[PDB]
Structures are given as C-alpha cells and as structure tokens.
Curated annotation (Swiss-Prot), chain B:
It comes from Homo sapiens. The gene is CYP3A4. Induction: By drugs, such as rifampicin. It is a single-pass membrane protein. This is Cytochrome P450 3A4. GO terms for molecular function: 1,8-cineole 2-exo-monooxygenase activity; 1-alpha,25-dihydroxyvitamin D3 23-hydroxylase activity; anandamide 11,12 epoxidase activity; anandamide 14,15 epoxidase activity; anandamide 8,9 epoxidase activity; caffeine oxidase activity; enzyme binding; estrogen 16-alpha-hydroxylase activity. The lineage of its organism: Eukaryota, Metazoa, Chordata, Craniata, Vertebrata. Belongs to the cytochrome P450 family.
Length: 445, 459
C-alpha cells in the first residue's frame, strides 16, 4: 500500500514500512508541508502510516475538491476515532448526518441571529477592559490568552445558551482547555493514526479519545442549561439528547480556543509592529469618537481592522491543513485520484508560498487593502476552509474577534516585555500555538 | 439670491452667478472646459452655482480623500439628487442612506475574484463572435463604426454573466436590448427638460406625481418586461441569483427594485464598456507604435493566439497601462459629486449643509502640475517605474471610497479580454473620415462628436 504514489507517478518522500512518513513530523505539520512544497513542486503524496495523503496546491484543483465535487466525492474529512457519542458532531458526522446538521445549525449565524448577540457581547467587553486595567495600572506583564480565554468562554456560553457565569478559576475554562491535547509524542495519538486498524477495537470497547470525566462536565452542563440552544430544542420537540451535547462541545471549544489563540496572535503582531497598532488605534477613534460603543455596522466599516485580522490568519492559520477523503475514483483537473486517498490542502504552506505572497514571512496588513486584495486567490488563502463544509462560525468568529479587538485598542496600547518571545516560536507539536505563552505590557491611554 | 452669496461669505472664489440661472450659461463648452478654466482662474478651491445649488469644487488630494473615503458613511454619503426617476429611485446608484447601504452589501458578492474567474469562459464565447464580425468588415475595405460592434459585444457579456441568457445569437444586429438601452438616457443640455428642471427644481415633485420620468416609458417597459421574462429560473450564482435567493430569504428586495438594479447593470455593462473601448482603439490607431508594442506583449503572453485566461489578463502590464492612460484622457465620469448632509470642517475648511462637493476628474487628469504633457497620449506614465508619481486621489477614473464603481474589476476584465482577442487577429488604422483630432461632445455625457470609425486589417 506504500507504492501507490509511485504507481500514479506522484512525487513524494520515501515512506518507511508501517510508519510511512510520520517520523518527518518532528518539526510539525507546518515545516513538513513547506519542505515538501519546495522539493516536489505543486502536487506530492506521503503516507500517514498506511493512509496515503495526496497534497494538492493548484487553486483550480482545490476548488474542485472543496466546492464543485464536495457533495459528490469529497464530502467527509479524515476518519477520526474512537469518538464514542461525539460521532454525531457536525465536524465528525459524515454524508447524510452532516447534511441535516449543517442546515440545522446554519440559522445560528444568520444576519439576524448574529445581530442579536451584539448587546450580549458588549457587556463582557467592559469586564475585559476592567480586568486588564487592574493589571495595567500596576506594572505586571499580562498573559494574553488567560484574559482573552475568559472573555471567549463568556461570549460562547451566552450567545449559544444565554447563561452568565464566567468572568479566574472557572470550571468551564479549566475543563475545556484540557478537552484535547494532540501531543504527537504521546504513543496514543501516534499509534491510532499510524496503525489505524485498531480503532474499531476501541470502539466496541467503549473507548474514546476525549477524556471521560471531561465529557461528563460538559454533558451535564448542557442538560443543566432564539439562540443556538433554542434552535435545536425546537427541532427536538431525529435530534436526540446525546447528539445535542456533542454540538455544544464543538461550539464551546471553538468559541473559546480559536478566539483566544488568534487574539493573542493579533496582539503579538501589534506589539512587534507599533506602526500597525497606532494606525489601527487612530481608525477606531475616528469611526467611534469619545470611545463610542461599537455596534454591528461600525465593525464592518473599519477597513484596516479587517486587514489586520486577515493578515494574522494568513500567518497563523490555526487549522494548518484542510482534508477531504476521496470516496470514489475521480479524475479532477487532469489528474486521477483513487478511492480512499486523503486529499490534503497545505493551508499553512500556501499562505507563505513566495509564488503567491511577496515577502511572506513579514507581517504586512497592506496585503488585504482594497488596492491589493485583487492579487489574493480565494483558494490559496483559506483560513476558514472553503465550499459547503467551511467554518460554520466564520461570520461569527470574524465578528466576535473584531468585537474584542475594538474595545481593547480604545483604552490600552501593548508593548513587549523583554520576556516576550520575539520572534514568536510556534509550537512544533500538534495544534498551532506558541511555545511560550504570549506576554505583553499593557499601558493605559 | 441669498444663496448666490454663500461663497463670498465663506471667502471662496468663483464665477459671478446670474439670478436664477447661476452659472449654467458657462456650460456652453461643457462641464470639462468650464472645470479647467475655473481651476486655472481660482486655484485649488472654487465655488459656483447650478441655478440655486451651490457647488464647491475641490482639488486637494487630502480633501478629496476625506470626502470620498474618510467621511463617506457619516457626511458625504449620497450624490446629487437625480429625478424624476419613478421606480428607478431604488437603483443602487440613486439610492440614499440605508437603502444604498442595503443594496451595496447585497450586490458586492457579484464581482468577487471567484465570480469574475467564472465569467472568463462565458466571455470567451462572444470574443470569437467579435472576431468573426470584424473579419467580415475586414475582408472588404470599408470603415467600421466601433461602438456598434463593441456595443453588441458588451450587451452579450452583461446579459449572460448577470442573468445567464443568450439574447444576441451571432447578431441579430437590430437587437431590441441594444436599441432601447442606447436611448435609455441622453442628457442633452440643449433639451430644455434637462435644463429647466435644474432652473425649476420645485417641479421634480410635480413631474413625479405626473408619472413623468427622465427615462422613456417604452424603454423602461421593455427592460421591465425582459427581467420578468428572465426571472423564471426553473444556473450558477450570478447577479440575478444574488437578488432572488435573498428575495426568497430588514426584508426585503421588491420586484420593482430587482428590475431597477438590472437596468443599471444592463446600461453600465453596455454603454461604459463600449464607449471606453472605442476611445482605446482610437488611441491605438493614432499611435501605431503603442498598438504594435501592445500586440507584441499579447503574442508573448499568449502565443499561437492562445485563449486568454483570468491569470494571463492580470499578467499583461502594458495592456493595463494602455487602459489606464485612455481613462485618464477620457474619464467617462467627468465629475465626482457628493452631497454634504451636515455642517463639517474638513482639512480646515468649513462646508455648510446642502452644498454639493464636486471633484473635477477631467480637469485633475489633465493638470500640468501633476502630469507631464497631459494632452499627449503616453502610456509610460502608468509603468511600474513611474507609478510612484501618481496620486490615487488625483487619478480617480472609477471613483474612490465605499461608493466607487462597483463594476470596476468587471469592466477592466471585460475590456481587456476584448482587446486581447481583437488585437490577436487585427490591426487598426485611421481612414481620413476618422475625426482627427477627436472632438469630444460639448454636450452632457463624455462621447465623441463624430462616431469613431477605423479601418480594420487582418493579420
Ligand atoms: C479564527 C477563528 C476560526 C478559524 C480560523 C476556523 C477555521 C476552521 C476551518 C479551516 C474549518 C474547516 C473548513 C474546511 O474543512 O473546509 C473549520 C470548521 C468548523 N468550524 Fe471553525 N474556525 C474558527 C472559529 C470557529 C468558531 C468560533 C466556531 C463556533 C461554532 C467554529 C465552528 C466550526 C465547525 C462546527 C466546523 C466544522 C463544520 C463542518 O464540519 O461542517 N469555528 N473551522
Ligand atoms: C470603464 C468602465 C467604467 C468606469 C470608468 C466607471 C466609473 C464609475 C465611477 C467614477 C463611478 C462613481 C464613483 C464615485 O462616485 O466615487 C461609478 C459608479 C457606478 N458604477 Fe461604474 N464605471 C465603469 C463601468 C461599470 C460597469 C461595467 C458596471 C456594471 C454594473 C458599473 C456599475 C456602477 C454602479 C452600480 C455605480 C454606482 C455605485 C454606487 O452608487 O454605490 N460601472 N462608475
Ligand atoms: C489532528 C488535529 C490536531 C489536526 O486535529 C484533530 O485532533 N481533529 C480534527 C477533527 S476532530 C475534532 C474533535 C474535537 C476537538 C475539540 C473539542 C471537541 C471536539 C473537531 O471536530 N474539531 C472541530 C471543532 C472546533 C474547531 C476547531 C478549529 C476550527 N473550527 C472549529 C480537528 C479539525 C481541524 C480542522 C477542521 C475541522 C476539525
Ligand atoms: C447626466 C450626467 C450623465 C451628465 O450625469 C448625471 O447627472 N448622472 C450621474 C448619476 S445618475 C445616473 C442615472 C441613470 C443613467 C442611465 C441609466 C440609468 C440611470 C446613474 O445612476 N448612473 C450610474 C449607473 C451606470 C453607470 C454609469 C457610469 C459609470 N458606472 C455606471 C451619472 C454618473 C456619472 C459618473 C459616475 C456614476 C454615475
């Protein structure tokens, strides 16, 4: 099964028996995709154990996988398990179950439901300022992901359930942060991916990848708790009480971890680029004079704010890779792909490809200016994926993150702390994060 | 009147206005010559009156950036009120305040880079028909009126990319869409109507209740019938789909507003594209060295007459320079106007509520203090070596800010796709009966006096 890419004439690194190419992940997914993107060209194929992975970089071929032939061939992501009752999650469900859940949870972020959440979010934007002010009046370096993670848990627990709890040692933030830790040197996540034929053993043995009593804390909390929660109970009165909790675990983890990590990535670039931070602070004071409260319309008007978010998502795509499982033999864009091959889009490697980005290692929000936005291919820069299975909370996350960036730069400027990791070392482990936590000095205006 | 002394109060120079008429009698040479003479007589800022309407003309790039970009949503949101229009008041180019903001966000995904890339194969069909029609008029020595053949090309591109319908099957030269759209609006200042409603603006609420419209009834009816005929849909995500999916679902888009937006896209796709293409070919015929150098770049990027693609169009640098230099000499917008909705003091200059701030684009594009030899056609100004000396607020052929040309990227792609396939097969020469030098229409809109005719030779 390791002579597949040799048969199809597709270049790639020579795989070792059983292991394949997983020993090249010692530098992480990001550095492995960039090295393979320069050695083999536009299209290459490696092996994750016995699973052949075809990496495509052609924007037209990316469009065929993600958009044109999504409902037909490339419908499901890589099989992940053992998951137990989490198999009913929209990000894990396949085919018919994904179609009914994608359409059910889509009205969660209609232009009306998302506008109902602005008065809910504006409350926690002041607690974020009032908590930073206590660590700003004193000369204490602030761990950004701690204060950003608390704000992210409040928004997702109120915009999806309507409960006010968070905002210190909060039980939701504590159990959600340890919900999953893909440390590739853990023999568990190493084996079940390299040697996957033992997954149905753990399935019939009632085993799961998510901790047992971490799933219990969130399973009984949803049973304890029109929004995201109301949009599903109305359809319940074949959504069962078990598939319901699986979706809440998805929204709580995504609304907390994805938001706080990007915000820390935003604040790091603004501290290492004071000209970008000051130019962004001058724009917020113009659209919102006298520290006016930001509304739904004033956020979309800020052009440079969207250019800073889009550039950071280019430098730090938290998903790193996009994956689709080929469900039947196809010949797309002049290339045959057999059934069972995982078609992967190196999102991290494409965002820094010199063929599509001038000076890619440098932080320049001017790439997304209305003059230069033309030169951006919508299938090379895909921080939220693309097609019918993109980020469902894209318009939610893009709004929720910008709502946090506005209320912070109105009152505080951020400077390095010397103990701040400059340059920022990404975590060469599993998910995308910094090695050392981001710490910055908070000076009040 | 009392208004007629507004600029003397503000200390702003300008021509002395006549009672009632104001300064409209100075339009006998047109908007352009009046703007150039005022720019040379009064300087960076001057004021005049279109009847009783004070118009403040600004030429400072910082003050232009403030009006078009910085203070758009808050102050300079709407253009000069245009009427009577009937149901066309719901058009995006005529809508105001919240209605324009609704329609702008609704029609923005029409021209994304993904949607524009999908239109290249559809445009590639009519590019071959454009050559076959030119080859007939080329195989026999005879002049060729360019706006007629360019207009039939522009109508097919805008009826298929926005609605998915083919209405001009290889011509069909007496196409009803082109015949009615060309007479949709002809602002002739000699016509008392377009001149009297400016002198008596109090008659616009009168003409509206009289069901009188600046657009003829038979043209609006035919365009209103066609959109209802095209709205069956039982295609991919196009301009018509973006209005139907949101119509099927504050709310919403009406049946009359959906026709109003289509007429705007039908007119802009036909008139603006065919007009600029005619000015481009006139400059290439009167400058054979520029035409040869452009043909050499097209043959280098697309050898063996290779079909143009979305990426190969953006690669041609000299083609973009030729399109930009023609738009500099012939800015079809001529003027850029915004209505000051409330009292402001931009760049240290007070502007009262109600004054129409105007940007003389034609005068700024020919200003000697910005361009060297502005009367001459020199595409080398827009080279990447000399583009550092080009102010983005002096050269505004598509406007600037949130209310710029929504079809800028589409018009640039459609014109370049037309110029590529034409110059791949033909070269253009004058024919004596071509008006040299080209006289611009001294009337309202920017057109030539005599139609552009050229001799077409096959390669
Ligand atoms: C900066 C913030 C975020 C980024 C960059 C991001 C990125 C992504 C990406 C790349 C995908 C896969 C798209 C594909 O495979 O084509 C995805 C899927 C998903 N995201 Fe996010 N995400 C973010 C925040 C959020 C938030 C706040 C939520 C809240 C619910 C969320 C919920 C989801 C779900 C449910 C899926 C799976 C959808 C499906 O499988 O049909 N994400 N996200
Ligand atoms: C060479 C071709 C074209 C040129 C030079 C041009 C130029 C302009 C300019 C200068 C404006 C006003 C900008 C401002 O006031 O700041 C405008 C408005 C507009 N143009 Fe174009 N245009 C062209 C072609 C097109 C095409 C093909 C369309 C197709 C739909 C189009 C649709 C519009 C619309 C809808 C507006 C009004 C936008 C609004 O009011 O928000 N234009 N155009
Ligand atoms: C192997 C790596 C580290 C690359 O990842 C995975 O361990 N497992 C992928 C699919 S299983 C995951 C299970 C899960 C995790 C946490 C909480 C609950 C369930 C999953 O469903 N997470 C999507 C939900 C949250 C999210 C995360 C990022 C962006 N938006 C939303 C993870 C993955 C990556 C990219 C797209 C979709 C899913
Ligand atoms: C009368 C003249 C031409 C001297 O001028 C004006 O007083 N009327 C300006 C704004 S009203 C116009 C009304 C209209 C015309 C024809 C059909 C339907 C309605 C309008 O909506 N046209 C924008 C739509 C199409 C277009 C035209 C040009 C560029 N792109 C798009 C005309 C104007 C000038 C410059 C930029 C934008 C508009």
């Amino acid at each position: 099964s390791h002579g597949l890419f040799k048969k199809l004439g597709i270049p790639g690194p020579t795989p070792l028996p059983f292991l394949g190419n997983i020993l090249s992940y010692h530098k992480g997914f990001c550095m492995f995709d960039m090295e393979c993107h320069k050695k083999y060209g536009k299209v290459w194929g490696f092996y994750d154990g016995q699973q052949p992975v075809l990496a495509i970089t052609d924007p037209d071929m990316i469009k065929t996988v993600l958009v044109k032939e999504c409902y037909s061939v490339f419908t499901n992501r890589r099989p992940f398990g053992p998951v137990g009752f989490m198999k009913s999650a929209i990000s894990i469900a396949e085919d018919e179950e994904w179609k009914r859940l994608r359409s059910l949870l889509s009205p969660t972020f209609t232009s009306g439901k998302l506008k109902e959440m602005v008065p809910i979010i504006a409350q926690y934007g002041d607690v974020l300022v009032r908590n930073l002010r206590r660590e700003a009046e004193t000369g204490k370096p602030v761990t950004l992901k701690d204060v950003f993670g608390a704000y992210s848990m409040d928004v997702i627990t109120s915009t999806s359930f309507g409960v006010n709890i968070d905002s210190p040692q909060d039980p939701f933030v504590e159990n959600t942060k340890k919900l999953l830790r893909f440390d590739f040197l853990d023999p568990f996540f190493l084996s079940i991916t390299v040697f996957p034929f033992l997954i149905p053993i753990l399935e019939v043995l009632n085993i799961c990848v998510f901790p047992r009593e971490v799933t219990n804390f969130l399973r009984k909390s949803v049973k304890r708790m029109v929004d995201f929660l109301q949009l599903m109970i109305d359809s319940q009165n074949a959504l069962s009480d078990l598939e319901l909790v699986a979706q809440s675990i998805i929204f709580i983890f995504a609304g907390y971890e994805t938001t706080s990590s990007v915000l820390s990535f935003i604040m790091y670039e603004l501290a290492t680029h004071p000209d970008v931070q000051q130019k962004l602070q001058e724009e917020i004071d113009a659209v919102l004079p006298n520290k006016a409260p930001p509304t739904y319309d004033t956020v979309l008007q800020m052009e440079y704010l969207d250019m800073v978010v889009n550039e950071t998502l280019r430098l730090f795509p938290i998903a790193m890779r996009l994956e689709r499982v080929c469900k039947k033999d196809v010949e797309i864009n002049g290339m045959f792909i057999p059934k069972g091959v995982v078609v992967m889009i190196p999102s991290y490697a494409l965002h820094r490809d010199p063929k599509y980005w001038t000076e890619p290692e440098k932080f320049l929000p001017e790439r997304f200016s209305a003059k230069n936005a033309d030169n951006i291919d919508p299938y090379i820069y895909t921080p939220f994926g693309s097609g019918p299975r993109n980020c469902i909370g894209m318009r939610f996350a893009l709004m929720n993150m910008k709502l946090a960036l506005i209320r912070v730069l109105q009152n505080f400027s951020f400077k390095p702390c010397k103990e701040t990791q400059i340059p920022l070392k990404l975590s060469l482990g599993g998910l995308l994060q910094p090695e050392k936590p981001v710490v910055l000095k908070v000076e009040s205006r």
